[PDB]
Design a protein around this motif. Structure first.
Motif, PDB file in Angstrom:
ATOM      1  N   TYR A 292       0.847  -1.187   0.000  1.00  0.00           N
ATOM      2  CA  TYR A 292       0.000   0.000   0.000  1.00  0.00           C
ATOM      3  C   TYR A 292       0.884   1.238   0.000  1.00  0.00           C
ATOM      4  CZ  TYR A 292      -3.970   2.994   1.513  1.00  0.00           C
ATOM      5  OH  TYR A 292      -4.961   3.940   1.636  1.00  0.00           O
ATOM      6  N   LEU A 293       1.830   1.271   0.930  1.00  0.00           N
ATOM      7  CA  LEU A 293       2.770   2.380   1.048  1.00  0.00           C
ATOM      8  C   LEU A 293       3.716   2.451  -0.148  1.00  0.00           C
ATOM      9  CD1 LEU A 293       3.868   2.148   4.813  1.00  0.00           C
ATOM     10  CD2 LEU A 293       2.495   3.939   3.742  1.00  0.00           C
ATOM     11  N   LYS A 294       4.222   1.301  -0.581  1.00  0.00           N
ATOM     12  CA  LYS A 294       5.154   1.273  -1.703  1.00  0.00           C
ATOM     13  C   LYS A 294       4.533   1.877  -2.955  1.00  0.00           C
ATOM     14  CE  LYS A 294       5.817  -2.422  -4.070  1.00  0.00           C
ATOM     15  NZ  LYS A 294       6.162  -3.800  -4.538  1.00  0.00           N
ATOM     16  N   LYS A 295       3.317   1.452  -3.265  1.00  0.00           N
ATOM     17  CA  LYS A 295       2.630   1.955  -4.443  1.00  0.00           C
ATOM     18  C   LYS A 295       2.433   3.465  -4.335  1.00  0.00           C
ATOM     19  CE  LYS A 295      -0.453  -0.740  -6.167  1.00  0.00           C
ATOM     20  NZ  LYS A 295       0.432  -1.049  -7.333  1.00  0.00           N
ATOM     21  N   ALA A 296       2.085   3.937  -3.144  1.00  0.00           N
ATOM     22  CA  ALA A 296       1.873   5.361  -2.942  1.00  0.00           C
ATOM     23  C   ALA A 296       3.164   6.167  -3.106  1.00  0.00           C
ATOM     24  CB  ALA A 296       1.272   5.609  -1.560  1.00  0.00           C
ATOM     25  N   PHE A 297       4.261   5.674  -2.533  1.00  0.00           N
ATOM     26  CA  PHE A 297       5.540   6.377  -2.610  1.00  0.00           C
ATOM     27  C   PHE A 297       6.388   6.110  -3.845  1.00  0.00           C
ATOM     28  CE2 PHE A 297       5.552   8.982   1.006  1.00  0.00           C
ATOM     29  CZ  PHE A 297       4.847   8.331   2.008  1.00  0.00           C
ATOM     30  N   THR A 298       6.049   5.077  -4.605  1.00  0.00           N
ATOM     31  CA  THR A 298       6.780   4.793  -5.833  1.00  0.00           C
ATOM     32  C   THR A 298       5.811   5.112  -6.962  1.00  0.00           C
ATOM     33  OG1 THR A 298       6.068   2.472  -5.948  1.00  0.00           O
ATOM     34  CG2 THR A 298       8.115   2.947  -4.753  1.00  0.00           C
ATOM     35  N   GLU A 299       4.967   6.110  -6.716  1.00  0.00           N
ATOM     36  CA  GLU A 299       3.964   6.560  -7.674  1.00  0.00           C
ATOM     37  C   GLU A 299       3.290   7.829  -7.158  1.00  0.00           C
ATOM     38  OE1 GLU A 299       0.260   6.158  -6.679  1.00  0.00           O
ATOM     39  OE2 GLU A 299       0.487   7.901  -7.995  1.00  0.00           O
TER      40      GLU A 299
ATOM     41  N   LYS B 239      24.884   4.765   2.151  1.00  0.00           N
ATOM     42  CA  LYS B 239      23.749   5.118   1.305  1.00  0.00           C
ATOM     43  C   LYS B 239      24.108   5.270  -0.171  1.00  0.00           C
ATOM     44  CE  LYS B 239      22.690   8.959   3.259  1.00  0.00           C
ATOM     45  NZ  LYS B 239      23.905   8.931   4.120  1.00  0.00           N
ATOM     46  N   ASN B 240      23.135   4.965  -1.022  1.00  0.00           N
ATOM     47  CA  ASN B 240      23.269   5.078  -2.470  1.00  0.00           C
ATOM     48  C   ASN B 240      24.319   4.188  -3.117  1.00  0.00           C
ATOM     49  OD1 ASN B 240      21.245   7.110  -2.375  1.00  0.00           O
ATOM     50  ND2 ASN B 240      22.808   8.654  -1.886  1.00  0.00           N
TER      51      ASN B 240
ATOM     52  N   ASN C 163       9.115  18.253 -14.129  1.00  0.00           N
ATOM     53  CA  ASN C 163       8.338  17.382 -15.010  1.00  0.00           C
ATOM     54  C   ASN C 163       8.753  15.911 -14.841  1.00  0.00           C
ATOM     55  OD1 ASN C 163       6.468  17.262 -17.511  1.00  0.00           O
ATOM     56  ND2 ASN C 163       8.286  16.134 -18.194  1.00  0.00           N
ATOM     57  N   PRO C 164       8.693  15.384 -13.606  1.00  0.00           N
ATOM     58  CA  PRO C 164       9.075  13.989 -13.348  1.00  0.00           C
ATOM     59  C   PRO C 164       8.241  12.959 -14.110  1.00  0.00           C
ATOM     60  CG  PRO C 164       7.772  14.803 -11.560  1.00  0.00           C
ATOM     61  CD  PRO C 164       8.145  16.006 -12.388  1.00  0.00           C
ATOM     62  N   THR C 165       8.917  11.997 -14.733  1.00  0.00           N
ATOM     63  CA  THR C 165       8.224  10.965 -15.493  1.00  0.00           C
ATOM     64  C   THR C 165       8.723   9.556 -15.159  1.00  0.00           C
ATOM     65  OG1 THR C 165       7.971  12.560 -17.321  1.00  0.00           O
ATOM     66  CG2 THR C 165       7.512  10.256 -17.809  1.00  0.00           C
ATOM     67  N   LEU C 166       9.724   9.462 -14.288  1.00  0.00           N
ATOM     68  CA  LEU C 166      10.290   8.171 -13.910  1.00  0.00           C
ATOM     69  C   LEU C 166      10.416   7.978 -12.404  1.00  0.00           C
ATOM     70  CD1 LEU C 166      11.048   6.851 -16.639  1.00  0.00           C
ATOM     71  CD2 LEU C 166      11.474   9.311 -16.616  1.00  0.00           C
ATOM     72  N   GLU C 167      10.578   6.725 -11.998  1.00  0.00           N
ATOM     73  CA  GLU C 167      10.758   6.397 -10.593  1.00  0.00           C
ATOM     74  C   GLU C 167      12.229   6.118 -10.349  1.00  0.00           C
ATOM     75  OE1 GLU C 167       8.163   3.219  -9.034  1.00  0.00           O
ATOM     76  OE2 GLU C 167       6.722   3.850 -10.575  1.00  0.00           O
ATOM     77  N   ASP C 168      12.778   6.681  -9.283  1.00  0.00           N
ATOM     78  CA  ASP C 168      14.167   6.403  -8.959  1.00  0.00           C
ATOM     79  C   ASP C 168      14.075   5.121  -8.133  1.00  0.00           C
ATOM     80  OD1 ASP C 168      16.814   8.116  -7.033  1.00  0.00           O
ATOM     81  OD2 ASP C 168      16.723   6.182  -8.063  1.00  0.00           O
ATOM     82  N   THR C 169      14.018   3.989  -8.830  1.00  0.00           N
ATOM     83  CA  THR C 169      13.891   2.674  -8.205  1.00  0.00           C
ATOM     84  C   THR C 169      14.804   2.392  -7.014  1.00  0.00           C
ATOM     85  OG1 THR C 169      13.280   1.802 -10.382  1.00  0.00           O
ATOM     86  CG2 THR C 169      13.738   0.209  -8.642  1.00  0.00           C
ATOM     87  N   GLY C 170      16.109   2.531  -7.222  1.00  0.00           N
ATOM     88  CA  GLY C 170      17.068   2.258  -6.170  1.00  0.00           C
ATOM     89  C   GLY C 170      16.979   3.117  -4.923  1.00  0.00           C
ATOM     90  N   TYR C 171      16.226   4.210  -4.987  1.00  0.00           N
ATOM     91  CA  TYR C 171      16.085   5.080  -3.828  1.00  0.00           C
ATOM     92  C   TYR C 171      15.214   4.370  -2.791  1.00  0.00           C
ATOM     93  CZ  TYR C 171      14.676   9.030  -0.892  1.00  0.00           C
ATOM     94  OH  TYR C 171      14.440   9.842   0.194  1.00  0.00           O
TER      95      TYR C 171
END
Lengths: 133, 133, 150, 146
Positions: free
Chosen positions: B71-78, C98-99, C142-150
């Motif tokens: 729930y949280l992941k979807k909210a924060f990764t979107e 981190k990172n 204008n963000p369009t991507l997710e910084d996955t590794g963050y």
């Protein structure tokens, strides 16, 4: 800083009780670890064995980990099953420089034959639950 | 000023008795928080766990918050549960919060302990999750 | 095989939306690109900018990379990369650095090349850095991507 | 009957993708060989480079092989091959490739030339470039990887 780790894990059923064995050797000294679980699988125990062997090493080390795991061999030589353990493995490998050695059984690998023995013995009298199964 | 927070929330039904568990680890020190609710949901307890974990901080801090909440992941990764989302934003504001959405409890010992706390609190709910809106 | 790369990364929050811009200039040839992320940090964008700029190189090259990243400057002028690997990437407290995902990616991206960093003290006399900063900031809005590794 | 071979190999990680480059030159004619691997080590690529360079020969020949490999230099100067178990009864390391090198050298009279670096060794600098280029697009598995 050259440490050797020999791991093996297996389940008596599919699923069924299981266990893992991990042997660490450093400068001629040896430590052994084993644990049994009430309900798990062959794959999960092979992965758990590597995870726990690595976690047993407290300080950063250059590691040579030997295991006859077909599950790990294929995974490293080539939703995802057992993602909980895969994540735990990546985290356990983090502080170390790990070189995996996927061996062909116990022939010529006495420590692995022994790790297998530890796993089987632990699987005969298991008490812990594999919380991620 | 670096703090680690491990949170977990769950419910036995939808709705149903539920609870949360939050573990805060600072340099050495450890604080834990848990509470049970008579009628709530998994989503709401997952959110409540993060909220209460963060509210426990008495001064600004760099926070690494580990949780398995989808729930949280979807909210924060979107909206469902506005009262809690509002509380979470307010609870995070004073801090530099880095969420870590874990894939399981293995390799995340504190998360397993947090889950234990939440489940144990759900078996004995004494509070009303009034907002179950 | 000489290439100049100008990169910049920034974020509107800590964490918050961020973005990066990268400009590559070869003899006469030029490549530019940028991307925004919904939730990230200034440090992560600064690192990502260098990573993506280098990843755009198709063959081994001698690289001069210009960035004002204080994060990269401290890491490279003090050799934190070697210091971290030696300590198993753990902080003085025993926690993971981190990172690391991005630092690892940077090391990989730099590996095929001979990289020389130029930690600029301003955007003057290096128009490309002014342009890269413009690109990064516009991407943050204008963000369009997710910084996955963050 | 004399052939010059210049080899070099490297990995972009430890482990990480890697590649090798081998250049053969005989009385002028030149042939080059390179390949990239998904997961390997620098030591393995330096060894693989020499192996494949020698395997490129089709007939027994007198060979002068130039490489800046510290791994190979140490192994040859200290007679490691002639010296398979470490002092403490531990598996060698990359024995699969050492065996491959022994076989690759067998048909030839090989004279090694371990150089310091690229300076004054342009063919070795080119072999290094080939190896780095191959590592950028690895598709092969270095099975023995150990």
């Amino acid at each position: 800083k050259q440490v050797e780790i020999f791991t093996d894990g297996s389940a008596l059923g599919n699923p069924g009780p299981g266990g893992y064995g991990a042997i660490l050797r450093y400068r001629g000294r040896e430590k052994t670890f084993s644990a049994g679980y009430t309900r798990t699988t062959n794959n999960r125990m092979e992965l758990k064995a590597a995870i726990e062997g690595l976690k047993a090493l407290k300080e950063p080390a250059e590691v040579d980990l030997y295991t006859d795991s077909h599950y790990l061999k294929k995974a490293f030589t080539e939703p995802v099953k057992n993602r909980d353990l895969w994540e735990a493995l990546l985290l356990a490998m983090a502080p170390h420089r790990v070189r995996f050695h996927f061996v062909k059984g116990h022939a010529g690998h006495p420590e692995n034959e022994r790790a297998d023995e530890l796993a089987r013995a632990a699987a005969m009298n298991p008490t812990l639950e594999d919380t991620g199964y």
